[PDB]
Structure formats: C-alpha cells, structure tokens
PDB file of all heavy atoms in Angstrom:
ATOM      1  N   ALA A 236      -8.748  -8.153  15.581  1.00  0.00           N
ATOM      2  CA  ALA A 236      -8.507  -7.011  14.691  1.00  0.00           C
ATOM      3  C   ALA A 236      -7.016  -6.797  14.436  1.00  0.00           C
ATOM      4  O   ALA A 236      -6.614  -6.490  13.308  1.00  0.00           O
ATOM      5  CB  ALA A 236      -9.132  -5.741  15.252  1.00  0.00           C
ATOM      6  N   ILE A 237      -6.202  -6.972  15.479  1.00  0.00           N
ATOM      7  CA  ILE A 237      -4.744  -6.814  15.363  1.00  0.00           C
ATOM      8  C   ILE A 237      -4.118  -7.810  14.374  1.00  0.00           C
ATOM      9  O   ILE A 237      -3.178  -7.460  13.668  1.00  0.00           O
ATOM     10  CB  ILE A 237      -4.062  -6.889  16.753  1.00  0.00           C
ATOM     11  CG1 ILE A 237      -4.442  -5.655  17.588  1.00  0.00           C
ATOM     12  CG2 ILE A 237      -2.540  -6.981  16.637  1.00  0.00           C
ATOM     13  CD1 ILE A 237      -4.295  -5.848  19.084  1.00  0.00           C
ATOM     14  N   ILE A 238      -4.657  -9.026  14.310  1.00  0.00           N
ATOM     15  CA  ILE A 238      -4.130 -10.087  13.432  1.00  0.00           C
ATOM     16  C   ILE A 238      -4.669 -10.018  11.986  1.00  0.00           C
ATOM     17  O   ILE A 238      -3.930 -10.289  11.036  1.00  0.00           O
ATOM     18  CB  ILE A 238      -4.420 -11.489  14.030  1.00  0.00           C
ATOM     19  CG1 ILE A 238      -3.797 -11.614  15.429  1.00  0.00           C
ATOM     20  CG2 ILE A 238      -3.884 -12.600  13.126  1.00  0.00           C
ATOM     21  CD1 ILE A 238      -4.310 -12.794  16.228  1.00  0.00           C
ATOM     22  N   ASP A 239      -5.944  -9.654  11.836  1.00  0.00           N
ATOM     23  CA  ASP A 239      -6.664  -9.717  10.551  1.00  0.00           C
ATOM     24  C   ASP A 239      -6.090  -8.743   9.502  1.00  0.00           C
ATOM     25  O   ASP A 239      -6.233  -7.526   9.658  1.00  0.00           O
ATOM     26  CB  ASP A 239      -8.162  -9.422  10.781  1.00  0.00           C
ATOM     27  CG  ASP A 239      -9.036  -9.748   9.571  1.00  0.00           C
ATOM     28  OD1 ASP A 239      -8.510 -10.006   8.468  1.00  0.00           O
ATOM     29  OD2 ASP A 239     -10.275  -9.743   9.731  1.00  0.00           O
ATOM     30  N   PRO A 240      -5.465  -9.273   8.419  1.00  0.00           N
ATOM     31  CA  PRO A 240      -4.972  -8.386   7.349  1.00  0.00           C
ATOM     32  C   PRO A 240      -6.062  -7.513   6.708  1.00  0.00           C
ATOM     33  O   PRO A 240      -5.796  -6.359   6.374  1.00  0.00           O
ATOM     34  CB  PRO A 240      -4.392  -9.364   6.317  1.00  0.00           C
ATOM     35  CG  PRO A 240      -4.117 -10.617   7.075  1.00  0.00           C
ATOM     36  CD  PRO A 240      -5.204 -10.692   8.099  1.00  0.00           C
ATOM     37  N   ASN A 241      -7.268  -8.060   6.555  1.00  0.00           N
ATOM     38  CA  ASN A 241      -8.413  -7.307   6.010  1.00  0.00           C
ATOM     39  C   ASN A 241      -8.913  -6.172   6.918  1.00  0.00           C
ATOM     40  O   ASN A 241      -9.564  -5.242   6.436  1.00  0.00           O
ATOM     41  CB  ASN A 241      -9.577  -8.248   5.634  1.00  0.00           C
ATOM     42  CG  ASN A 241      -9.364  -8.946   4.297  1.00  0.00           C
ATOM     43  OD1 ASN A 241      -8.230  -9.147   3.858  1.00  0.00           O
ATOM     44  ND2 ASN A 241     -10.460  -9.312   3.640  1.00  0.00           N
ATOM     45  N   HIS A 242      -8.619  -6.236   8.216  1.00  0.00           N
ATOM     46  CA  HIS A 242      -8.886  -5.103   9.102  1.00  0.00           C
ATOM     47  C   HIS A 242      -7.910  -3.955   8.797  1.00  0.00           C
ATOM     48  O   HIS A 242      -6.781  -3.938   9.290  1.00  0.00           O
ATOM     49  CB  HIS A 242      -8.803  -5.518  10.571  1.00  0.00           C
ATOM     50  CG  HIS A 242      -9.361  -4.495  11.512  1.00  0.00           C
ATOM     51  ND1 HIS A 242      -8.739  -3.289  11.755  1.00  0.00           N
ATOM     52  CD2 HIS A 242     -10.488  -4.495  12.261  1.00  0.00           C
ATOM     53  CE1 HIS A 242      -9.456  -2.592  12.618  1.00  0.00           C
ATOM     54  NE2 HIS A 242     -10.521  -3.302  12.942  1.00  0.00           N
ATOM     55  N   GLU A 243      -8.356  -3.010   7.969  1.00  0.00           N
ATOM     56  CA  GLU A 243      -7.544  -1.848   7.579  1.00  0.00           C
ATOM     57  C   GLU A 243      -7.413  -0.847   8.740  1.00  0.00           C
ATOM     58  O   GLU A 243      -8.421  -0.361   9.252  1.00  0.00           O
ATOM     59  CB  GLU A 243      -8.179  -1.163   6.358  1.00  0.00           C
ATOM     60  CG  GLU A 243      -7.337  -0.065   5.709  1.00  0.00           C
ATOM     61  CD  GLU A 243      -8.111   0.763   4.688  1.00  0.00           C
ATOM     62  OE1 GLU A 243      -9.106   0.260   4.116  1.00  0.00           O
ATOM     63  OE2 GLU A 243      -7.719   1.927   4.451  1.00  0.00           O
ATOM     64  N   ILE A 244      -6.181  -0.544   9.150  1.00  0.00           N
ATOM     65  CA  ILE A 244      -5.941   0.489  10.164  1.00  0.00           C
ATOM     66  C   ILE A 244      -6.090   1.868   9.518  1.00  0.00           C
ATOM     67  O   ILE A 244      -5.623   2.094   8.400  1.00  0.00           O
ATOM     68  CB  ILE A 244      -4.546   0.360  10.827  1.00  0.00           C
ATOM     69  CG1 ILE A 244      -4.436  -0.964  11.596  1.00  0.00           C
ATOM     70  CG2 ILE A 244      -4.270   1.530  11.779  1.00  0.00           C
ATOM     71  CD1 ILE A 244      -3.039  -1.292  12.085  1.00  0.00           C
ATOM     72  N   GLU A 245      -6.734   2.780  10.246  1.00  0.00           N
ATOM     73  CA  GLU A 245      -6.944   4.159   9.803  1.00  0.00           C
ATOM     74  C   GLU A 245      -5.646   4.944   9.930  1.00  0.00           C
ATOM     75  O   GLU A 245      -4.915   4.783  10.902  1.00  0.00           O
ATOM     76  CB  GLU A 245      -8.008   4.858  10.664  1.00  0.00           C
ATOM     77  CG  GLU A 245      -9.376   4.188  10.715  1.00  0.00           C
ATOM     78  CD  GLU A 245     -10.060   4.117   9.361  1.00  0.00           C
ATOM     79  OE1 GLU A 245      -9.960   5.090   8.581  1.00  0.00           O
ATOM     80  OE2 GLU A 245     -10.710   3.087   9.076  1.00  0.00           O
ATOM     81  N   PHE A 246      -5.359   5.789   8.946  1.00  0.00           N
ATOM     82  CA  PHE A 246      -4.269   6.757   9.049  1.00  0.00           C
ATOM     83  C   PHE A 246      -4.769   8.084   8.493  1.00  0.00           C
ATOM     84  O   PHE A 246      -4.455   8.435   7.353  1.00  0.00           O
ATOM     85  CB  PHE A 246      -3.032   6.286   8.282  1.00  0.00           C
ATOM     86  CG  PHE A 246      -2.411   5.042   8.837  1.00  0.00           C
ATOM     87  CD1 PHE A 246      -2.696   3.798   8.281  1.00  0.00           C
ATOM     88  CD2 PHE A 246      -1.532   5.107   9.915  1.00  0.00           C
ATOM     89  CE1 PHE A 246      -2.119   2.645   8.791  1.00  0.00           C
ATOM     90  CE2 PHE A 246      -0.951   3.956  10.428  1.00  0.00           C
ATOM     91  CZ  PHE A 246      -1.244   2.725   9.865  1.00  0.00           C
ATOM     92  N   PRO A 247      -5.575   8.815   9.288  1.00  0.00           N
ATOM     93  CA  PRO A 247      -6.093  10.116   8.859  1.00  0.00           C
ATOM     94  C   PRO A 247      -5.012  11.087   8.355  1.00  0.00           C
ATOM     95  O   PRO A 247      -3.915  11.142   8.926  1.00  0.00           O
ATOM     96  CB  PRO A 247      -6.760  10.657  10.125  1.00  0.00           C
ATOM     97  CG  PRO A 247      -7.168   9.450  10.890  1.00  0.00           C
ATOM     98  CD  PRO A 247      -6.162   8.386  10.572  1.00  0.00           C
ATOM     99  N   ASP A 248      -5.334  11.824   7.287  1.00  0.00           N
ATOM    100  CA  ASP A 248      -4.401  12.776   6.670  1.00  0.00           C
ATOM    101  C   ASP A 248      -4.021  13.904   7.617  1.00  0.00           C
ATOM    102  O   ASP A 248      -4.875  14.459   8.308  1.00  0.00           O
ATOM    103  CB  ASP A 248      -4.975  13.380   5.374  1.00  0.00           C
ATOM    104  CG  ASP A 248      -4.584  12.597   4.131  1.00  0.00           C
ATOM    105  OD1 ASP A 248      -3.586  11.841   4.171  1.00  0.00           O
ATOM    106  OD2 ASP A 248      -5.268  12.757   3.096  1.00  0.00           O
ATOM    107  N   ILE A 249      -2.731  14.232   7.628  1.00  0.00           N
ATOM    108  CA  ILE A 249      -2.169  15.262   8.497  1.00  0.00           C
ATOM    109  C   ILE A 249      -1.040  15.968   7.740  1.00  0.00           C
ATOM    110  O   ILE A 249      -0.525  15.412   6.763  1.00  0.00           O
ATOM    111  CB  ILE A 249      -1.650  14.670   9.834  1.00  0.00           C
ATOM    112  CG1 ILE A 249      -0.863  13.371   9.597  1.00  0.00           C
ATOM    113  CG2 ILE A 249      -2.808  14.398  10.778  1.00  0.00           C
ATOM    114  CD1 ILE A 249      -0.145  12.838  10.819  1.00  0.00           C
ATOM    115  N   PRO A 250      -0.660  17.192   8.174  1.00  0.00           N
ATOM    116  CA  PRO A 250       0.423  17.962   7.523  1.00  0.00           C
ATOM    117  C   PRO A 250       1.765  17.229   7.384  1.00  0.00           C
ATOM    118  O   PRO A 250       2.417  17.322   6.341  1.00  0.00           O
ATOM    119  CB  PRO A 250       0.594  19.177   8.442  1.00  0.00           C
ATOM    120  CG  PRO A 250      -0.724  19.338   9.106  1.00  0.00           C
ATOM    121  CD  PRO A 250      -1.280  17.959   9.275  1.00  0.00           C
ATOM    122  N   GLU A 251       2.157  16.503   8.427  1.00  0.00           N
ATOM    123  CA  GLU A 251       3.431  15.786   8.444  1.00  0.00           C
ATOM    124  C   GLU A 251       3.284  14.479   7.672  1.00  0.00           C
ATOM    125  O   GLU A 251       2.867  13.469   8.226  1.00  0.00           O
ATOM    126  CB  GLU A 251       3.876  15.529   9.884  1.00  0.00           C
ATOM    127  CG  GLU A 251       3.871  16.778  10.751  1.00  0.00           C
ATOM    128  CD  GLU A 251       4.686  16.619  12.015  1.00  0.00           C
ATOM    129  OE1 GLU A 251       5.927  16.539  11.923  1.00  0.00           O
ATOM    130  OE2 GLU A 251       4.085  16.583  13.101  1.00  0.00           O
ATOM    131  N   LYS A 252       3.605  14.518   6.381  1.00  0.00           N
ATOM    132  CA  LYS A 252       3.484  13.337   5.516  1.00  0.00           C
ATOM    133  C   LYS A 252       4.543  12.289   5.860  1.00  0.00           C
ATOM    134  O   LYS A 252       4.328  11.082   5.656  1.00  0.00           O
ATOM    135  CB  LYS A 252       3.587  13.719   4.030  1.00  0.00           C
ATOM    136  CG  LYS A 252       2.505  14.662   3.525  1.00  0.00           C
ATOM    137  CD  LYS A 252       1.125  14.019   3.512  1.00  0.00           C
ATOM    138  CE  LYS A 252       0.051  15.024   3.118  1.00  0.00           C
ATOM    139  NZ  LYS A 252      -1.309  14.570   3.523  1.00  0.00           N
ATOM    140  N   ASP A 253       5.680  12.754   6.376  1.00  0.00           N
ATOM    141  CA  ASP A 253       6.724  11.861   6.871  1.00  0.00           C
ATOM    142  C   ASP A 253       6.257  11.072   8.103  1.00  0.00           C
ATOM    143  O   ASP A 253       6.598   9.900   8.248  1.00  0.00           O
ATOM    144  CB  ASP A 253       8.015  12.646   7.169  1.00  0.00           C
ATOM    145  CG  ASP A 253       8.690  13.193   5.899  1.00  0.00           C
ATOM    146  OD1 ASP A 253       8.423  12.683   4.784  1.00  0.00           O
ATOM    147  OD2 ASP A 253       9.505  14.138   6.023  1.00  0.00           O
ATOM    148  N   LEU A 254       5.463  11.706   8.966  1.00  0.00           N
ATOM    149  CA  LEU A 254       4.909  11.044  10.152  1.00  0.00           C
ATOM    150  C   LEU A 254       3.861   9.977   9.792  1.00  0.00           C
ATOM    151  O   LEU A 254       3.846   8.880  10.377  1.00  0.00           O
ATOM    152  CB  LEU A 254       4.318  12.090  11.103  1.00  0.00           C
ATOM    153  CG  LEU A 254       3.769  11.629  12.457  1.00  0.00           C
ATOM    154  CD1 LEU A 254       4.704  10.663  13.181  1.00  0.00           C
ATOM    155  CD2 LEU A 254       3.482  12.852  13.314  1.00  0.00           C
ATOM    156  N   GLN A 255       2.992  10.310   8.837  1.00  0.00           N
ATOM    157  CA  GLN A 255       2.066   9.342   8.238  1.00  0.00           C
ATOM    158  C   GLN A 255       2.815   8.123   7.728  1.00  0.00           C
ATOM    159  O   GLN A 255       2.388   6.999   7.961  1.00  0.00           O
ATOM    160  CB  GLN A 255       1.295   9.946   7.050  1.00  0.00           C
ATOM    161  CG  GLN A 255      -0.020  10.642   7.376  1.00  0.00           C
ATOM    162  CD  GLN A 255      -0.972  10.630   6.185  1.00  0.00           C
ATOM    163  OE1 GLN A 255      -1.503   9.578   5.815  1.00  0.00           O
ATOM    164  NE2 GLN A 255      -1.181  11.797   5.571  1.00  0.00           N
ATOM    165  N   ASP A 256       3.916   8.359   7.015  1.00  0.00           N
ATOM    166  CA  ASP A 256       4.709   7.273   6.445  1.00  0.00           C
ATOM    167  C   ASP A 256       5.311   6.371   7.520  1.00  0.00           C
ATOM    168  O   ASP A 256       5.248   5.146   7.405  1.00  0.00           O
ATOM    169  CB  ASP A 256       5.822   7.818   5.548  1.00  0.00           C
ATOM    170  CG  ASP A 256       6.501   6.722   4.734  1.00  0.00           C
ATOM    171  OD1 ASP A 256       5.796   6.010   3.986  1.00  0.00           O
ATOM    172  OD2 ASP A 256       7.734   6.563   4.835  1.00  0.00           O
ATOM    173  N   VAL A 257       5.877   6.980   8.560  1.00  0.00           N
ATOM    174  CA  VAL A 257       6.467   6.237   9.680  1.00  0.00           C
ATOM    175  C   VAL A 257       5.450   5.297  10.316  1.00  0.00           C
ATOM    176  O   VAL A 257       5.764   4.140  10.584  1.00  0.00           O
ATOM    177  CB  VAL A 257       7.029   7.176  10.774  1.00  0.00           C
ATOM    178  CG1 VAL A 257       7.402   6.398  12.030  1.00  0.00           C
ATOM    179  CG2 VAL A 257       8.254   7.920  10.272  1.00  0.00           C
ATOM    180  N   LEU A 258       4.240   5.800  10.548  1.00  0.00           N
ATOM    181  CA  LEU A 258       3.187   5.013  11.216  1.00  0.00           C
ATOM    182  C   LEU A 258       2.701   3.820  10.369  1.00  0.00           C
ATOM    183  O   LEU A 258       2.530   2.700  10.872  1.00  0.00           O
ATOM    184  CB  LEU A 258       2.019   5.925  11.609  1.00  0.00           C
ATOM    185  CG  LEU A 258       2.379   6.980  12.660  1.00  0.00           C
ATOM    186  CD1 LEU A 258       1.358   8.104  12.682  1.00  0.00           C
ATOM    187  CD2 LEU A 258       2.517   6.351  14.035  1.00  0.00           C
ATOM    188  N   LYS A 259       2.497   4.070   9.084  1.00  0.00           N
ATOM    189  CA  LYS A 259       2.167   3.017   8.132  1.00  0.00           C
ATOM    190  C   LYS A 259       3.271   1.960   8.066  1.00  0.00           C
ATOM    191  O   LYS A 259       2.977   0.774   7.938  1.00  0.00           O
ATOM    192  CB  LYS A 259       1.907   3.606   6.738  1.00  0.00           C
ATOM    193  CG  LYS A 259       0.622   4.422   6.644  1.00  0.00           C
ATOM    194  CD  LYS A 259       0.538   5.181   5.331  1.00  0.00           C
ATOM    195  CE  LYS A 259      -0.735   6.012   5.235  1.00  0.00           C
ATOM    196  NZ  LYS A 259      -0.597   7.139   4.267  1.00  0.00           N
ATOM    197  N   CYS A 260       4.527   2.393   8.167  1.00  0.00           N
ATOM    198  CA  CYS A 260       5.677   1.476   8.120  1.00  0.00           C
ATOM    199  C   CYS A 260       5.873   0.634   9.378  1.00  0.00           C
ATOM    200  O   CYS A 260       6.250  -0.539   9.289  1.00  0.00           O
ATOM    201  CB  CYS A 260       6.963   2.244   7.813  1.00  0.00           C
ATOM    202  SG  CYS A 260       7.100   2.696   6.073  1.00  0.00           S
ATOM    203  N   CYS A 261       5.649   1.244  10.539  1.00  0.00           N
ATOM    204  CA  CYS A 261       5.719   0.534  11.820  1.00  0.00           C
ATOM    205  C   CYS A 261       4.584  -0.467  12.011  1.00  0.00           C
ATOM    206  O   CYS A 261       4.796  -1.518  12.620  1.00  0.00           O
ATOM    207  CB  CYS A 261       5.728   1.519  12.987  1.00  0.00           C
ATOM    208  SG  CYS A 261       7.193   2.568  12.994  1.00  0.00           S
ATOM    209  N   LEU A 262       3.396  -0.150  11.497  1.00  0.00           N
ATOM    210  CA  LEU A 262       2.215  -0.984  11.736  1.00  0.00           C
ATOM    211  C   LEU A 262       1.811  -1.861  10.542  1.00  0.00           C
ATOM    212  O   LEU A 262       0.624  -2.103  10.310  1.00  0.00           O
ATOM    213  CB  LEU A 262       1.056  -0.114  12.229  1.00  0.00           C
ATOM    214  CG  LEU A 262       1.392   0.735  13.465  1.00  0.00           C
ATOM    215  CD1 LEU A 262       0.184   1.573  13.849  1.00  0.00           C
ATOM    216  CD2 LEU A 262       1.858  -0.110  14.643  1.00  0.00           C
ATOM    217  N   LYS A 263       2.812  -2.351   9.808  1.00  0.00           N
ATOM    218  CA  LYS A 263       2.637  -3.488   8.905  1.00  0.00           C
ATOM    219  C   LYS A 263       2.626  -4.770   9.751  1.00  0.00           C
ATOM    220  O   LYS A 263       3.538  -5.004  10.548  1.00  0.00           O
ATOM    221  CB  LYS A 263       3.755  -3.539   7.852  1.00  0.00           C
ATOM    222  CG  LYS A 263       3.705  -2.405   6.835  1.00  0.00           C
ATOM    223  CD  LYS A 263       5.013  -2.265   6.063  1.00  0.00           C
ATOM    224  CE  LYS A 263       5.050  -1.028   5.166  1.00  0.00           C
ATOM    225  NZ  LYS A 263       4.021  -1.023   4.091  1.00  0.00           N
ATOM    226  N   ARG A 264       1.592  -5.590   9.574  1.00  0.00           N
ATOM    227  CA  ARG A 264       1.396  -6.787  10.396  1.00  0.00           C
ATOM    228  C   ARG A 264       2.459  -7.855  10.152  1.00  0.00           C
ATOM    229  O   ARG A 264       2.878  -8.530  11.099  1.00  0.00           O
ATOM    230  CB  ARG A 264       0.008  -7.382  10.175  1.00  0.00           C
ATOM    231  CG  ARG A 264      -1.121  -6.458  10.581  1.00  0.00           C
ATOM    232  CD  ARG A 264      -2.452  -7.185  10.599  1.00  0.00           C
ATOM    233  NE  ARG A 264      -3.489  -6.357  11.213  1.00  0.00           N
ATOM    234  CZ  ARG A 264      -4.270  -5.478  10.578  1.00  0.00           C
ATOM    235  NH1 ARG A 264      -4.186  -5.273   9.260  1.00  0.00           N
ATOM    236  NH2 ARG A 264      -5.172  -4.797  11.280  1.00  0.00           N
ATOM    237  N   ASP A 265       2.887  -8.004   8.895  1.00  0.00           N
ATOM    238  CA  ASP A 265       3.972  -8.923   8.540  1.00  0.00           C
ATOM    239  C   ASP A 265       5.286  -8.331   9.060  1.00  0.00           C
ATOM    240  O   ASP A 265       5.720  -7.301   8.555  1.00  0.00           O
ATOM    241  CB  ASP A 265       4.030  -9.117   7.015  1.00  0.00           C
ATOM    242  CG  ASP A 265       5.002 -10.226   6.576  1.00  0.00           C
ATOM    243  OD1 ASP A 265       5.769 -10.769   7.402  1.00  0.00           O
ATOM    244  OD2 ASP A 265       4.991 -10.552   5.369  1.00  0.00           O
TER     245      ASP A 265
END
C-alpha cells in the first residue's frame, strides 16, 4: 500500500487547511 500510487491516502477535511496541505505535501510517494 505504501508503494502503490493507485492506493489513495485519505486526508479527511478539517478546519486547518494549512495542516491538510502539509500532510498531502509530505506524503507524496515520489
């Protein structure tokens, strides 16, 4: 799952949109 690009990681919506962005940015597989 960690390697598979098609395995979409969940990022549930939360008040801190900047925090959502940080997590999406850190957990790009490439």
Side-chain angles (χ1 to χ4, degrees):
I237 292 158
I238 302 165
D239 192 349
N241 281 26
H242 193 290
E243 189 191 335
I244 296 170
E245 303 298 321
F246 295 98
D248 268 339
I249 44 171
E251 309 197 69
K252 298 293 175 199
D253 292 340
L254 184 46
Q255 271 206 70
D256 191 57
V257 170
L258 295 162
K259 290 170 181 157
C260 283
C261 296
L262 305 179
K263 291 164 187 298
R264 297 191 170 89
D265 189 352

